[PDB]
Structure 1
Amino acid sequence: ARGPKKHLKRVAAPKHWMLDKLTGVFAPRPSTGPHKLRECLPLIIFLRNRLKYALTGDEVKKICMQRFIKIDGKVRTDITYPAGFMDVISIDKTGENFRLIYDTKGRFAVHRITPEEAKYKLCKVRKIFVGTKGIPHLVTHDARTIRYPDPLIKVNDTIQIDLETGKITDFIKFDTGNLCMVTGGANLGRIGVITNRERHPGSFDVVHVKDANGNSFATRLSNIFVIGKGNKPWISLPRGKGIRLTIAEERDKRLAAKQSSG
C-alpha cells in the first residue's frame, strides 16, 4: 500500500473478540491508543457484544456521545478506543465498574468490580531512561510516562497508579515467589507464582511459573505481569482463579453442575 490501513476485515480480527462470521465483512478496527490492536478490546465490543447494552453500532455512538463512559477516569467519546489490560471502565449512570482482566481461556471477561477498587490500576514498567537536565522517567505498557519514579523501580516490575492523580503509590519488584499473570501466548490468562527465570542473553528470558495446583508452565519474559507480592493479588481475580482446567475436568464440571437443577 501507500500509507496506513484504515479498515479491518472480520476474519482477520483478533480471535478473542469472538465476532461471528456472518454479520459483516468488516470488524471495528481499533483506534491508535495505549494498546496494540491485537492486545485490546474496543469500546464498541464491550458495549454491544459483551454487555448487551447496545444493539447496533449506532447505539454505541449514542451511548458514548452522552459522555456516560470513563476509561481510566477520563471520558471517552471514541467507540473504537482500544481498552486493554488493567483498564478500569466506570459507568456512573448505572453504577457499575469493570476491569479488563484476562480469564483462563485467552480472552477478556466481564469482571464487575467495586468502586473502592476502581481508583487504582497496576501497570508494568517497560523502559526507564533519564534525560532533560537529569530527570528520570518511566514508560509503562499504557504509554503512561511518570517522571520522578522511585529509584527502586526497574524494568519488568509493577507499579500501582492512582487514577485520579496519575502518581505512583507503591510497587512490586520482579523476583521469584511473586504472583504473576501471563498476558500473551498459549498460557494467556493464567495465574501462578514465579518459580525461576532463565536468562538467554541476546534472546528472550524464559520465566517458569507454578500454579496453585502444581501445574508448571513457562513463557517468555514479555508475557509476564507481576500482580501480587507473595501470593496475594493486589487486584481482584475473575470467577475462575487463573487456573486452567483441562477439557476432561472442564466437561466434568458441566455434567456435575447440571445435576443441581430442579
Structure 2
Amino acid sequence: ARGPKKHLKRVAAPKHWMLDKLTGVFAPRPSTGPHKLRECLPLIIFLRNRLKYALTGDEVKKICMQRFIKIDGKVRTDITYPAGFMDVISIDKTGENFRLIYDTKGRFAVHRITPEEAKYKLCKVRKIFVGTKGIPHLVTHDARTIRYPDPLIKVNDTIQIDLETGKITDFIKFDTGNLCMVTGGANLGRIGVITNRERHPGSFDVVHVKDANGNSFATRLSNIFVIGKGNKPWISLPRGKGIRLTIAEERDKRLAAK
C-alpha cells in the first residue's frame, strides 16, 4: 500500500502478548522506538494485562499522563511505547521496579527487582564504528549510541550501562564458557553456558549452548545475549532458572503441587 501502516489487527499481533480474540478487532500497535515491533511490549499491555492495574484503555493513559512511570530512569507518557529486553520499568509512586526478562516458555514475565538493581542494565553491542575526527562509536540492541567506548569492546560483546548517566561501568566478552540467554527462535528464554561457535562465512554463525541440567541445544549468533561472566549471572533470573523442563515433569510438578 501507499506510505507506512498505522493500525495492527488483534490476531496479527505477536503471540507472546497473549491477547484474546473477542476483546476487540485491533491491538496496541507498538510505536516506533529502540526495540522492534515484533520483539517489544507496549506499556498498555504491561499495565492493563500483566500488572492488572488498569481495566480499560482510558485508565492506562490516566496512569501514564500523571507521569508516575519511568523506563530506564526517563519519564514516558506514550502508552504504546516499546519497552523490550533488559529495559527497567520504574513505578516511583508505589516504589516497584521491573526488568523485562523472557521466561522459559518464551514471553516477557512480571519479574520484580530491588530498587538498588534498577540503577544499571546489560546491553549487546550491534556494531562499532568511528567517525569525524575519530571518536569511535558503539551502537547497542536498544539503540543507545555511546561515544568513546573501551577499545576491548568488540561486536557481539555485552556492556553494563548506569541508567542515570550514559557510560559503560563494565563489559563481558563473547567467549567459550560464558552464561548466555536466547532472544529468538524455538529456544527463546533458555539460559545456558556457551560450548562453541561454528563460523559459516557468508551465512549465519551457529553456537552450541549447554543448559545447567545437562541439556545441549544450538541457536543462531544474532539470537544470543551474554548475561554472566563464567557461570555467575550479573542480573537476577526469573522464577525458574531459565531451565526448559519438559511437559512430562511440567505435569509431575503441577500434580505434585496439587
TM-score norm. by structure 2 comes to 1.00
Map Cα deviations across residues 8-29 of structure 1 (whole Å, 9 max, x no partner).
0000000000000000000000
Q: 1:141 deviation in Å?
A: 0.6
Report the Cα distance in structure 1 between the residues aligned to 2:229 and 2:34, rounded to whole angstroms: 26
Report the Cα distance in structure 1 between the residues aligned to 2:53 and 2:66, rounded to whole angstroms: 14
Q: 1:129 deviation in Å?
A: 0.4
Q: 1:112 deviation in Å?
A: 0.5
Please name the residue that 1:192 is paired with: 192
Report the Cα distance in structure 2 between the residues aligned to 1:55 and 1:94, rounded to whole angstroms: 18
- Aligned-partner SS, 2:256: helix
Q: 1:95 deviation in Å?
A: 1.0
- Aligned-partner SS, 2:171: coil
Report the Cα distance in structure 1 between the residues aligned to 2:205 and 2:214, rounded to whole angstroms: 22
Report the Cα distance in structure 2 between the residues aligned to 1:218 and 1:161, rounded to whole angstroms: 29
Report the Cα distance in structure 1 between the residues aligned to 2:214 and 2:22, rounded to whole angstroms: 42
Q: 1:245 deviation in Å?
A: 1.0
Report the Cα distance in structure 2 between the residues aligned to 1:132 and 1:103, rounded to whole angstroms: 42
Report the Cα distance in structure 2 between the residues aligned to 1:142 and 1:227, rounded to whole angstroms: 15
What is the Cα-based RMSD across aligned positions, in Å? 0.4
Structure 2 gap segments, 5+ residues each: none
Report the Cα distance in structure 2 between the residues aligned to 1:33 and 1:129, rounded to whole angstroms: 22
Report the Cα distance in structure 2 between the residues aligned to 1:218 and 1:116, rounded to whole angstroms: 35
Report the Cα distance in structure 2 between the residues aligned to 1:184 and 1:232, rounded to whole angstroms: 22
Report the Cα distance in structure 2 between the residues aligned to 1:145 and 1:30, rounded to whole angstroms: 22
Report the Cα distance in structure 2 between the residues aligned to 1:225 and 1:24, rounded to whole angstroms: 35
Please name the residue that 1:93 is paired with: 93
Report the Cα distance in structure 2 between the residues aligned to 1:43 and 1:232, rounded to whole angstroms: 31
Report the Cα distance in structure 2 between the residues aligned to 1:75 and 1:123, rounded to whole angstroms: 20
Report the Cα distance in structure 1 between the residues aligned to 2:47 and 2:87, rounded to whole angstroms: 15
Report the Cα distance in structure 2 between the residues aligned to 1:89 and 1:130, rounded to whole angstroms: 32
Matched length: 258
The reply on whether 1:116 has 2:116 as its aligned counterpart is: yes
Q: 1:60 deviation in Å?
A: 0.4
Map Cα deviations across residues 17-63 of structure 1 (whole Å, 9 max, x no partner).
00000000000000100000000011000000000000111110000
Map Cα deviations across residues 138-165 of structure 1 (whole Å, 9 max, x no partner).
0001110111000000000000000000
Report the Cα distance in structure 1 between the residues aligned to 2:72 and 2:8, rounded to whole angstroms: 26
Report the Cα distance in structure 2 between the residues aligned to 1:166 and 1:113, rounded to whole angstroms: 21
- Aligned-partner SS, 1:170: strand
Moved over 6 A (4+): none
Q: 1:102 deviation in Å?
A: 0.3
Map Cα deviations across residues 50-109 of structure 1 (whole Å, 9 max, x no partner).
000001111100000000000010000100000000000000100110000000001010
- Aligned-partner SS, 1:195: strand
Report the Cα distance in structure 1 between the residues aligned to 2:132 and 2:30, rounded to whole angstroms: 33
Report the Cα distance in structure 1 between the residues aligned to 2:130 and 2:242, rounded to whole angstroms: 37
TM-score norm. by structure 1 comes to 0.98
Report the Cα distance in structure 2 between the residues aligned to 1:256 and 1:143, rounded to whole angstroms: 45
- Aligned-partner SS, 1:32: coil
Report the Cα distance in structure 1 between the residues aligned to 2:9 and 2:72, rounded to whole angstroms: 28
Report the Cα distance in structure 2 between the residues aligned to 1:97 and 1:64, rounded to whole angstroms: 16
Report the Cα distance in structure 2 between the residues aligned to 1:166 and 1:44, rounded to whole angstroms: 27
The reply on whether 1:126 has 2:149 as its aligned counterpart is: no
- Aligned-partner SS, 1:128: strand
Report the Cα distance in structure 2 between the residues aligned to 1:58 and 1:210, rounded to whole angstroms: 46
Map Cα deviations across residues 203-245 of structure 1 (whole Å, 9 max, x no partner).
0100100000110001000000000010010000000010011
Report the Cα distance in structure 2 between the residues aligned to 1:71 and 1:102, rounded to whole angstroms: 17
- Aligned-partner SS, 2:170: coil
Report the Cα distance in structure 2 between the residues aligned to 1:92 and 1:202, rounded to whole angstroms: 48
Please name the residue that 2:17 is paired with: 17
Report the Cα distance in structure 2 between the residues aligned to 1:231 and 1:44, rounded to whole angstroms: 36
